[PDB]
Amino acid sequence: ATVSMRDMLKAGVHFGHQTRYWNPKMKPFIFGARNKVHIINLEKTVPMFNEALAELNKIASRKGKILFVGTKRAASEAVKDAALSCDQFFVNHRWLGGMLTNWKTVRQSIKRLKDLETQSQDGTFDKLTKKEALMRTRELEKLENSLGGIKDMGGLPDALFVIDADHEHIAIKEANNLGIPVFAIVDTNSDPDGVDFVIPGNDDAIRAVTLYLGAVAATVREGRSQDLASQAE
């Protein structure tokens, strides 16, 4: 969990957006302006990232629920695989508005969802109608899209790992309203005050995004190693 100060350099973490769209609060993590862009200070970046990795690792050791948030279509696919690989669930694209707080109301939704899945190999064969069948399939698809990947939780998650943060400002607001700690790959245009572990990376190119995903994925496996067994053979 000590990603080479050079691997990210090729990944694309250094390239932010332009001044026209630059959060003035991000000044502590600036190195200059290549073609009027804003090159994040990697030297400033790296201690925070590695520190959060350790933080997130001790979490998984205490068996605290983790979570990830879907972003752009490419980001969403990448997030899904890394999450499914281990555990810690994952969002997909919309965050289903006020999931936190309205977690009891969406709990009933999760209940109905799972029942339909179970009844998708039951109710389908018997009493099938050229009308009702389309109803069942379509609704499941919509529900699955976002609710799927969270249905497992069966309770309130104890952590959150979003990306970019700006695209999900809504998610951070609810998390701040409950104490649940969070981590965000803040970029040059993202309000980080609400975050408890500022990862000043770049939600772009996917390449670099895949790096962050791969990194954390590894740290949560160390948590599982403490939850399963130590390295040996």
Binding site: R6, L9, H14, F31, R34, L42, E43
Partner: peptide, 9 residues
């Protein structure tokens, strides 16, 4: 693009 290390030097 030039390496960050050389640029920072």
């Amino acid at each position: 693009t030039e390496s960050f290390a050389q640029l920072f030097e």
